[PDB]
Each structure stands twice: as C-alpha cells, then as structure tokens.
Amino acid sequence: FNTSDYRFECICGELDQIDRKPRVQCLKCHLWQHAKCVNYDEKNLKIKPFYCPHCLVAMEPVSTR
Ligand SMILES: [Zn+2]
Ligand SMILES: [Zn+2]
C-alpha cells in the first residue's frame, strides 16, 4: 500500500554535497536537494529555514473546488 514512497534526492540527479554544490535538507519532507537548485545559498543555510520548491507550492492554495 503506497502512502509515501521514500525516494529523496536533488531534482538534477548529480550529487548532494556542499563541497561541490551546496545542499538544503528539506526538513518538511526529509528531501535532500541543492541550495543552488532551489534558488537558495549555503551562507544563510547556517541561519534561515530551507525547503525544496514543491513544499513552497504545497503550502500555497490549489486551483480547485
Ligand atoms: Zn541539484
Ligand atoms: Zn520538501
């Protein structure tokens, strides 16, 4: 019974390590994406909250009745 499939990786499918490309660990859905793939940076990763683009859209209302 499929409720939530546990596939979590950055949408480019290259790496996930701040050595090469900075990465945000989207706490809201345990999704490991890149900062420079979600329009974010590692400098404020130290400070501010960080998510994958789908969680932004999901917090926003959907066009339906
Ligand atoms: Zn990426
Ligand atoms: Zn997310």
Write b or e for each residue in 5-31: b if 16 or more Cβ atoms lie within 10 A of its Cβ, otherwise e: eeeeebeeeeebeeeebbbbebeeeeb
Write out the two tokens for 32: 């490991």
Experimental method reported for this structure = NMR
Distance 56 CA to ligand 2 centre (A): 8
Distance 27 CA to ligand 2 centre (A): 7
Distance 49 CA to ligand 2 centre (A): 12
Signed CA dihedral, 36, 28, 8, 20: sign only: positive
Which domains does the chain possess? 1-65 (3.30.40.10)
Q: Nearest bound ligand to CA 31? A: 2
Q: Which residue is it, tokens 């404020």?
A: 44
Distance 64 CA to ligand 1 centre (A): 31
Contacts of 14 (CB under 8 A, 6+ apart): 21
Report the distance separating Cα 34 and Cα 51, nearest Å.
Answer: 10
DSSP state of 31: E
The three-state secondary structure class of 37 is: helix
Report the distance separating Cα 39 and Cα 33, nearest Å.
Answer: 11
